[PDB]
Design a protein around this ligand. Sequence first.
Ligand SMILES: NC(=O)C1=CN([C@@H]2O[C@H](COP(=O)(O)OP(=O)(O)OC[C@H]3O[C@@H](n4cnc5c(N)ncnc54)[C@H](OP(=O)(O)O)[C@@H]3O)[C@@H](O)[C@H]2O)C=CC1
Ligand SMILES: NC(=O)C1=CN([C@@H]2O[C@H](COP(=O)(O)OP(=O)(O)OC[C@H]3O[C@@H](n4cnc5c(N)ncnc54)[C@H](OP(=O)(O)O)[C@@H]3O)[C@@H](O)[C@H]2O)C=CC1
Ligand SMILES: [Cl-]
Ligand SMILES: [Cl-]
Ligand SMILES: [Zn+2]
Ligand SMILES: [Zn+2]
Lengths: 349, 349
Amino acid sequence: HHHHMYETFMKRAIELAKKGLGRVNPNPPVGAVVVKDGRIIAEGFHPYFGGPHAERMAIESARKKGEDLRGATLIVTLEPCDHHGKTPPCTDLIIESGIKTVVIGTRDPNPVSGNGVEKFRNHGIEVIEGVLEEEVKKLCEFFITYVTKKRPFVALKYASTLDGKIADHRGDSKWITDKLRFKVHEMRNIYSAVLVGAGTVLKDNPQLTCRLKEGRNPVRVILDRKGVLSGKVFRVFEENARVIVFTESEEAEYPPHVEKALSDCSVESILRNLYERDIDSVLVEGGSKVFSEFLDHADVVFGFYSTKIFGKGLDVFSGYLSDVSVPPKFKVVNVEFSDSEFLVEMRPC
Amino acid sequence: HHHHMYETFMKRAIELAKKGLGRVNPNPPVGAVVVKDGRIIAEGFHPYFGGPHAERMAIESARKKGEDLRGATLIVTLEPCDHHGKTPPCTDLIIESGIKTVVIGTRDPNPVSGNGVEKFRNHGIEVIEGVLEEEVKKLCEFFITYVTKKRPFVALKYASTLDGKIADHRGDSKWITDKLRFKVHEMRNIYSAVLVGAGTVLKDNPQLTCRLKEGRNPVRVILDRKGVLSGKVFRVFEENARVIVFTESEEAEYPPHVEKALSDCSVESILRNLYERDIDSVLVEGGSKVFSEFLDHADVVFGFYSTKIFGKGLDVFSGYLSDVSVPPKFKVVNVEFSDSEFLVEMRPC
Ligand SMILES: NC(=O)C1=CN([C@@H]2O[C@H](COP(=O)(O)OP(=O)(O)OC[C@H]3O[C@@H](n4cnc5c(N)ncnc54)[C@H](OP(=O)(O)O)[C@@H]3O)[C@@H](O)[C@H]2O)C=CC1
Ligand SMILES: NC(=O)C1=CN([C@@H]2O[C@H](COP(=O)(O)OP(=O)(O)OC[C@H]3O[C@@H](n4cnc5c(N)ncnc54)[C@H](OP(=O)(O)O)[C@@H]3O)[C@@H](O)[C@H]2O)C=CC1
Ligand SMILES: [Cl-]
Ligand SMILES: [Cl-]
Ligand SMILES: [Zn+2]
Ligand SMILES: [Zn+2]
């Protein structure tokens, strides 16, 4: 009865949370709904990094509407904070509002958030934990990775022909993804950073922007170990996003608004460096050498395919080598298709 | 009302028809159900090439049960024949049984079957045409192709890594397909012939048998233009199936139960030759040169993928060449996945 209703309400809370994806990072996305006598009476989401917490938005909304919250229920994706930020903690707000039941998707893995569940139970409140927990952990996987592993979540996205080519015999890559391009721009609108190698910049001179007009551009991370992009203004160096170039070249020079990060350039150093720049997620977009280096480090792989067939061309993972005896390292968790294209989502075993 | 019931009954007729797939070829698979006062009272399917027609099986079954067929309805996938074979035509049987309504999925494209629909309507019977017609044409696509295009239906099936490799750097292909192997054996149990090149025979020495114990082995078609398989007993030459080797070598010699077909070896000549040997369907299974040659001739392509990644290896279509400017020639009509594997069905645009 209630548990099915709690799942229905948690579904809406997740939908609410998603409104902040790409803006809250590296905070988690959070959604909150306040229910009274079975009706949602207010809603809230975390809108941007350092903005109001979802619970506060929802509770203040309710009060503005003249709702009496005494005896109401809060359904919230993440355990409410129990630390004084700029404001008192959400725990105190919830307690003082008269809310009697708090339903949580997952506990906050960040130690500094404190013991919200315990505080609530110490003030007579019913705390129900784990409603749609798996869905909520997926929702917050960037944050969970950032907090628990101290690195960004890594996705690897490629566009390939049926025969595993990311470019034809001339090195041309245009026009492989078409009807599934919207998925890429969705990803660019959510991932904090997108990452490409210098061979891609030299060959394709890509924008790497989110093409949704009202979206936001992700941070561009350019891997240029040897400094071959020095002294030129490629489209990835346009001043429409934060831009970081990792290189081992002291000589290399990039435009003044681009951060040059002189580095040993190991995947490990790159990921630590990004963590230290508050980047909770990176979308590795190529090319072949980059794919090859990051493949063992990906938390998710998105293979965008086309029914095109090139015959000869640049292989997706041309720098990798394995053989038939090595078992697969990924499982398929989802496939989508449209017209001449399909998208496979894979996750590490 | 009735039309929904006709679709329900036609669904069962299709399910019945499928019991003959792989055995009826090059006849079509056909299913029949007899319904009286809303109940299925008898069923029938075409069991093997030159066997009883589905309608006859169903009508004789009903009579054996003591059912009075006067005023009953027949639902049958394919338009009943109006030619005297060994037996009188199904049209006469149906008329004489007292059946008043005949519901057909699709008309028979074979001219020799005659004008069943018209005969029925001339003997007062209600003929309803086109129920689940698209599904039935899919069911009979081998036969429809055979009759209307005078060639076998061609499917191309490959097993590839994510990066488009059908073999690793050592030429090893073992263990790519695992959890989807059952789909391959299903196909081998239904397609009249399976086809491979000599490079595959030399490298893999495959059985190319249907591994379902109670299935049946398809005809093996081996493409050996140069006669490199001469004088050796590969597993494809075991006497557990009909075997045809196409070659331009007069010198080549194969075991006595193998048919040597001396040919110019064009895809066109091969397909005509197979048509002339009453083969209504061929499953092209590799390798790379063969895939490359047949790709433009495939009616359907089945890409079996694994999340394995080889890095370097033998490309699926290593003999083909295209580029980014060529539009895709296939649409995705279905995707299935399990564990570390996925299957994409593609059809020509
Ligand atoms: N269809 C698709 O999904 C896409 C296709 N493409 C195609 O791929 C091709 C480009 O691929 P490719 O040529 O392999 O080039 P990459 O884009 O993989 O760039 C390789 C360059 O990046 C540097 N690099 C690689 N890893 C690092 C790192 N860890 N830190 C710093 N620098 C690093 C390399 O340094 P070093 O020389 O020392 O190794 C090299 O200079 C183009 O043809 C493009 O059209 C590109 C992206 C996606
Ligand atoms: N993972 C998978 O789906 C599979 C992988 N494999 C792998 O593929 C490899 C074999 O591929 P590949 O080497 O390209 O060899 P193929 O199996 O494609 O065989 C090529 C041979 O067949 C002959 N041939 C090709 N077309 C015709 C034709 N129209 N008529 C008569 N003869 C023809 C060729 O003649 P000519 O020399 O004159 O061109 C050549 O001798 C092996 O490594 C095997 O392990 C094989 C099958 C499937
Ligand atoms: Cl771009
Ligand atoms: Cl086999
Ligand atoms: Zn809070
Ligand atoms: Zn008949």
